[PDB]
Motif scaffolding. Structure first.
Motif, PDB file in Angstrom:
ATOM      1  N   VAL A   1      52.743 -75.717  41.412  1.00 43.86           N
ATOM      2  CA  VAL A   1      53.793 -75.015  41.266  1.00 43.86           C
ATOM      3  C   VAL A   1      54.661 -75.014  42.435  1.00 43.86           C
ATOM      4  N   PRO A   2      55.616 -75.042  41.116  1.00 46.00           N
ATOM      5  CA  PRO A   2      56.628 -75.102  41.962  1.00 46.00           C
ATOM      6  C   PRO A   2      57.235 -73.976  42.912  1.00 46.00           C
ATOM      7  N   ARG A   3      57.515 -74.283  44.256  1.00 45.56           N
ATOM      8  CA  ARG A   3      57.904 -73.075  45.553  1.00 45.56           C
ATOM      9  C   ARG A   3      58.703 -72.147  44.992  1.00 45.56           C
ATOM     10  N   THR A   4      59.533 -72.188  44.149  1.00 51.45           N
ATOM     11  CA  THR A   4      60.494 -71.349  43.880  1.00 51.45           C
ATOM     12  C   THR A   4      60.359 -70.561  42.259  1.00 51.45           C
ATOM     13  N   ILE A   5      58.817 -70.707  41.825  1.00 48.77           N
ATOM     14  CA  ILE A   5      58.636 -70.436  40.777  1.00 48.77           C
ATOM     15  C   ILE A   5      58.948 -68.815  40.901  1.00 48.77           C
ATOM     16  N   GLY A   6      58.304 -67.973  41.964  1.00 46.17           N
ATOM     17  CA  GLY A   6      58.925 -66.293  41.592  1.00 46.17           C
ATOM     18  C   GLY A   6      60.280 -66.038  41.322  1.00 46.17           C
ATOM     19  N   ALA A   7      60.802 -65.940  42.620  1.00 47.70           N
ATOM     20  CA  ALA A   7      62.629 -66.236  42.374  1.00 47.70           C
ATOM     21  C   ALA A   7      63.217 -66.329  41.001  1.00 47.70           C
ATOM     22  N   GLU A   8      62.650 -67.405  40.447  1.00 41.84           N
ATOM     23  CA  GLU A   8      63.033 -67.978  39.072  1.00 41.84           C
ATOM     24  C   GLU A   8      62.452 -67.187  38.114  1.00 41.84           C
ATOM     25  N   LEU A   9      61.532 -66.779  38.247  1.00 44.00           N
ATOM     26  CA  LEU A   9      60.852 -65.789  36.926  1.00 44.00           C
ATOM     27  C   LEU A   9      61.478 -64.623  37.016  1.00 44.00           C
ATOM     28  N   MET A  10      61.482 -63.717  38.105  1.00 40.04           N
ATOM     29  CA  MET A  10      62.608 -63.118  38.916  1.00 40.04           C
ATOM     30  C   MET A  10      63.705 -62.394  37.953  1.00 40.04           C
ATOM     31  N   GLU A  11      64.505 -63.759  37.883  1.00 45.98           N
ATOM     32  CA  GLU A  11      65.678 -64.092  37.201  1.00 45.98           C
ATOM     33  C   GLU A  11      66.038 -63.743  36.017  1.00 45.98           C
ATOM     34  N   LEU A  12      65.095 -65.337  35.457  1.00 42.24           N
ATOM     35  CA  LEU A  12      64.733 -64.857  34.065  1.00 42.24           C
ATOM     36  C   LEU A  12      64.803 -63.900  33.104  1.00 42.24           C
ATOM     37  N   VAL A  13      63.700 -62.683  33.792  1.00 39.13           N
ATOM     38  CA  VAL A  13      63.179 -61.608  33.533  1.00 39.13           C
ATOM     39  C   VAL A  13      64.291 -60.593  33.266  1.00 39.13           C
ATOM     40  N   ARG A  14      64.373 -60.902  34.442  1.00 40.45           N
ATOM     41  CA  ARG A  14      65.841 -60.094  35.100  1.00 40.45           C
ATOM     42  C   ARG A  14      66.580 -59.988  34.264  1.00 40.45           C
ATOM     43  N   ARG A  15      67.402 -61.250  33.206  1.00 43.36           N
ATOM     44  CA  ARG A  15      68.800 -61.581  32.840  1.00 43.36           C
ATOM     45  C   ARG A  15      68.563 -61.313  31.405  1.00 43.36           C
ATOM     46  N   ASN A  16      67.730 -61.656  30.610  1.00 48.46           N
ATOM     47  CA  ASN A  16      67.038 -61.108  29.158  1.00 48.46           C
ATOM     48  C   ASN A  16      65.859 -60.638  28.875  1.00 48.46           C
ATOM     49  N   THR A  17      66.092 -59.885  29.526  1.00 45.61           N
ATOM     50  CA  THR A  17      64.905 -58.385  29.289  1.00 45.61           C
ATOM     51  C   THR A  17      66.584 -57.236  29.736  1.00 45.61           C
ATOM     52  N   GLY A  18      67.285 -57.219  30.816  1.00 47.76           N
ATOM     53  CA  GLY A  18      67.529 -56.019  31.088  1.00 47.76           C
ATOM     54  C   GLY A  18      67.142 -54.948  31.918  1.00 47.76           C
ATOM     55  N   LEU A  19      65.637 -55.844  32.618  1.00 47.36           N
ATOM     56  CA  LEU A  19      64.952 -54.469  33.130  1.00 47.36           C
ATOM     57  C   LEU A  19      65.176 -54.544  34.702  1.00 47.36           C
ATOM     58  N   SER A  20      64.508 -54.079  35.337  1.00 53.82           N
ATOM     59  CA  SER A  20      64.539 -53.845  36.970  1.00 53.82           C
ATOM     60  C   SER A  20      64.243 -54.822  37.982  1.00 53.82           C
ATOM     61  N   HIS A  21      64.720 -55.068  38.936  1.00 51.77           N
ATOM     62  CA  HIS A  21      63.754 -55.653  40.456  1.00 51.77           C
ATOM     63  C   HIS A  21      62.631 -55.574  40.601  1.00 51.77           C
ATOM     64  N   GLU A  22      62.007 -54.073  40.759  1.00 47.89           N
ATOM     65  CA  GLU A  22      60.959 -53.942  40.542  1.00 47.89           C
ATOM     66  C   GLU A  22      59.776 -53.525  39.757  1.00 47.89           C
ATOM     67  N   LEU A  23      60.948 -53.413  38.306  1.00 48.16           N
ATOM     68  CA  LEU A  23      59.909 -53.429  37.016  1.00 48.16           C
ATOM     69  C   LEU A  23      59.444 -55.252  36.292  1.00 48.16           C
ATOM     70  N   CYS A  24      60.145 -55.979  37.220  1.00 46.09           N
ATOM     71  CA  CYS A  24      60.469 -57.640  36.772  1.00 46.09           C
ATOM     72  C   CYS A  24      59.335 -57.886  37.563  1.00 46.09           C
ATOM     73  N   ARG A  25      59.021 -57.492  38.576  1.00 43.37           N
ATOM     74  CA  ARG A  25      58.212 -58.049  39.773  1.00 43.37           C
ATOM     75  C   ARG A  25      57.001 -57.878  39.107  1.00 43.37           C
ATOM     76  N   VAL A  26      56.524 -55.912  38.195  1.00 41.33           N
ATOM     77  CA  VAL A  26      55.638 -55.358  37.711  1.00 41.33           C
ATOM     78  C   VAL A  26      55.700 -56.448  37.059  1.00 41.33           C
ATOM     79  N   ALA A  27      56.225 -56.523  36.226  1.00 41.31           N
ATOM     80  CA  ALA A  27      55.964 -57.272  34.988  1.00 41.31           C
ATOM     81  C   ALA A  27      54.775 -59.096  34.718  1.00 41.31           C
TER      82      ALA A  27
END
Length: 382
Positions: A1-27
Motif C-alpha cells: 500500500v502506497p504511503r500516500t493513499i489517504g490524501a490521494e483518495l481524499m483528493e479524488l473523492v473531493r474533486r469528483n463527488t464534490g463531497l466535504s473533507h469530513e464526509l470524504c474521510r467518512v465515505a
C-alpha cells in the motif's frame, strides 16, 4: 500500500463527488471498513489504507477566486456572477481542508484577505456584502492570525459605519454585529484609528439598540455581546470609550439586567473560537470595568445591586478551589465594595464574612487558590 493513499483518495473523492473533507474521510472509512469487515483476509491492505488516513482543486480554485476578486473590477460585473464567486469561496472555506485554506489566506502577507476587505469596502450590494461577511466569518474559524489581520485592517471600521448607516437591514446588521463580535474576540491589538470610527458614539449606538431596540429581537443580545467583545481589550477606568458612553447616559436598566442574567449564567458569550493564549472572561471583565468607577457603577439600580451581590457571592461560595473563575468573582466583589455603598446596605454580608473566613482558611497548596488568597486578604478592609 502506497504511503500516500489517504490524501490521494481524499483528493479524488473531493474533486469528483464534490463531497466535504469530513464526509470524504467518512465515505472512505465506510467503504474500506465494510470491505474489510465482509471480506475477511482483505484486512492487511484495508487497515493500512485506514492508517494512511491519519496541487489540489480547492487550492487552485482559491487561487483563481482570490486573484479575480483582487482585480475593483468586481464592482463592474453582474451581481449573480460575484454571487457565485462568493458562494464558491464560502463553500471552499467551509468544506475543504482547513490547512489548505490557512495556507492560501496567508499568502503574500494576507494579500487575498486584505484584498477581500478592500473589496468589501466598495461593494454596496447587500447580497454580496452578506456573502462577504459570511466568508470573513469562515476565515475567522480557521486561524487567529487571520483574525489579527482583519482587526488590523479597515474591516471593523467599515462594519461599524455600515451598521450606523444601513440600520434598516436587520440581517446584514446581525451578521455585521456577529463578525465584529468575532474579530474583537481575540483581544490582541487595538488600533485607535478605528477608535475614531468606533468610539463612545458607536458604543452609545449599540447601547441604544440594547435598551430601546429596532422597529425577532435577535439584535439586542448580539449588540450586548458586541459590547462585550469591544470592551474585552479597552482601557481600565477613565479612558474607556464604552464606560464613557455609560458615564454620559447611566439610564440603562435593560442592559444592566442583561448583564445580571449573563453573570448568572456564568458562561462567556464572547468566547467563540479556540486559539492560543485564551483571552479573559467578557462578562466578568466588563463588570469589573463597570465597578472600576462609581459613575459607571451607577448603571446598577438599588435592586439590581443587591441581586448582583447575591449572584457574585453565590459564585464565590460555589466555585471549588482551583477554578480560574473564583479569583475574578472575588475581584468583582472587591471592586463592588470599592465602587458602591456596600457598607450602607450591608446586604449579603453576614454570609460574605463566612465566605472570606472559609476562603482564607483554605489549606489548598495550589497557585490559583493562592492568588485568590492574596486577593481576599487584600479585600479584608474592616
Amino acid at each position: 500500500v502506497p504511503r500516500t493513499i489517504g490524501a490521494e483518495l481524499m483528493e479524488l473523492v473531493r474533486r469528483n463527488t464534490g463531497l466535504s473533507h469530513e464526509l470524504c474521510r467518512v465515505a472512505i472509512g465506510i467503504i474500506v471498513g465494510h470491505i474489510q469487515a465482509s471480506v475477511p483476509a482483505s484486512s492487511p491492505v484495508m487497515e493500512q489504507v485506514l492508517l494512511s488516513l491519519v496541487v489540489c482543486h480547492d487550492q487552485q480554485r482559491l487561487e483563481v477566486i482570490f486573484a479575480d476578486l483582487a482585480r475593483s473590477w468586481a464592482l463592474y460585473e453582474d451581481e449573480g456572477v460575484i454571487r457565485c464567486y462568493l458562494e464558491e469561496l464560502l463553500h471552499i472555506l467551509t468544506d475543504a481542508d482547513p490547512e489548505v485554506c490557512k495556507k492560501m489566506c496567508k499568502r503574500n502577507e494576507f494579500e487575498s484577505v486584505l484584498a477581500l476587505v478592500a473589496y468589501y469596502q466598495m461593494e454596496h450590494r447587500a447580497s454580496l456584502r452578506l456573502l462577504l461577511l459570511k466568508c470573513f466569518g469562515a476565515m475567522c474559524s480557521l486561524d487567529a492570525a487571520i483574525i489579527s489581520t482583519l482587526v488590523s485592517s479597515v474591516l471593523p471600521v467599515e462594519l461599524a459605519r455600515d451598521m450606523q448607516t444601513d440600520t434598516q437591514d436587520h440581517q446584514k446588521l446581525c451578521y455585521s454585529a456577529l463578525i465584529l463580535a468575532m474579530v474583537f474576540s481575540m483581544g490582541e491589538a487595538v488600533p485607535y484609528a478605528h477608535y475614531e470610527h468606533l468610539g463612545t458614539p458607536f458604543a452609545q449606538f449599540l447601547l441604544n439598540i440594547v435598551e430601546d431596540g429596532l422597529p425577532t429581537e435577535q439584535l439586542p443580545d448580539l449588540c450586548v455581546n458586541l459590547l462585550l467583545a469591544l470592551n474585552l481589550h479597552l482601557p481600565a477606568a477613565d479612558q474607556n470609550v464604552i464606560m464613557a458612553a455609560l458615564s454620559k447616559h447611566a439610564n440603562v436598566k435593560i442592559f444592566s439586567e442583561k448583564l445580571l442574567l449573563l453573570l448568572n449564567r456564568g458562561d462567556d458569550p464572547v468566547r467563540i473560537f479556540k486559539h492560543e493564549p485564551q483571552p479573559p472572561h467578557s462578562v466578568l471583565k466588563f463588570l469589573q470595568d463597570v465597578f472600576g468607577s462609581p459613575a459607571t457603577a451607577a448603571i446598577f439600580y438599588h435592586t439590581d445591586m443587591m441581586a448582583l451581590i447575591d449572584i457574585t457571592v453565590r459564585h464565590i461560595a460555589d466555585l471549588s478551589p482551583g477554578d480560574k473563575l473564583r479569583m475574578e468573582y472575588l475581584s468583582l466583589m472587591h471592586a463592588i465594595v470599592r465602587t458602591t455603598p456596600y457598607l450602607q446596605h450591608r446586604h449579603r454580608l453576614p454570609d460574605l464574612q463566612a465566605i472570606l473566613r472559609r476562603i482564607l482558611n483554605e489549606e489548598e497548596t495550589s497557585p490559583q487558590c493562592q492568588m485568590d488568597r492574596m486577593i481576599v486578604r487584600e479585600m479584608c478592609k474592616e
